[PDB]
């Protein structure tokens, strides 16, 4: 038996004032022996030595503390075996601490179809910029004609599609969508026009 190959899908995000969040996927080959953990190392782009942040990580994610806002950090993860750590996986580009994580951008071109006397089927596109955190679903609001007071239609939805139901026969409705990531919900999207029943 031998050492594992390198971890996969090494990404970062959730950049705060003094931390960054690393996320990865297991290696393709364990070496013939089950893995024991992961090694997480950092190295500021203007410094020459990798320093070990943590060892024997069992999760597929790690939050690195104690980062100095306005530096740039490299990161690499390896996988642990009965034989010791395997080859390292690197982040794609340095982590820059000045730009914190925020709320996601508004979703894109909202569309509608399948209108009934009671329901409408709405689709939309994911936003371009998630704000530095992965998107955790979407929120759909509807606003009746005789009002400007929006009401959430159901619960968050991970898909970029939702069938709105519970609509009153013959009434006029416009719909808008917000995306959500870790630090909350986007400024709402480009609203639709008012649509009735059939």
Author numbering: -1 to 196
Question: What's in the article?
Answer:
To gain an insight into the possible molecular determinants of I110 recognition by anti-titin antibodies, we elucidated the 3D-structure of the isolated I110 domain, the double tandem I110-I111 and the full-length MIR region I109-I110 using X-ray crystallography. C-terminally, I110 is joined to the subsequent domain by a flexible three residue long, hydrophilic linker, STA. No direct contacts exist between I110 and I111, so that the linker sequence acts as an effective hinge permitting the free repositioning of both domains. Accordingly, the structures of I110-I111 and I109-I111 show a different mutual arrangement of these domains. The I110 domain showed a stable and same structure when isolated and arrayed with its neighboring domains. The only common element between all MIR protein fragments which were bound to sera in this ELISA screening is the central FnIII domain, I110, suggesting that this domain may contain the binding epitope(s) for anti-titin antibodies in MG patients. The average values of Figure 2B show more clearly that binding to I109-I110, I110-I111 or I110 alone does not significantly differ from their binding to the whole MIR, suggesting that the main binding interface is located in the common element, I110, and that the other domains play no or only a minor role in antibody binding. Importantly, as with the MG sera, binding to domain I110 was very similar to that observed against the full-length MIR tandem, whereas, similarly to the MG sera, practically no serum was bound to domain I111.
Titin is a giant, elastic, sarcomeric protein with a molecular weight of more than 3800 kD. Titin consists primarily of two types of protein domains: fibronectin type III (FnIII) domains and immunoglobulin (Ig) domains (ca 100 residues in length) that account for over 90% of its mass. Despite the repetitive composition of titin, a single main immunogenic region (MIR) has so far been identified in its chain that elicits the reactivity of almost all known anti-titin antibodies in MG patients. This 30 kD segment, also termed MGT30, consists of a domain triplet of composition Ig-FnIII-FnIII located in the titin segment at the junction of the I- and A-bands (I/A) and corresponding to domains 4 to 6 in this region of the chain, i.e., tandem I109-I111 also termed I/A4-I/A6,.
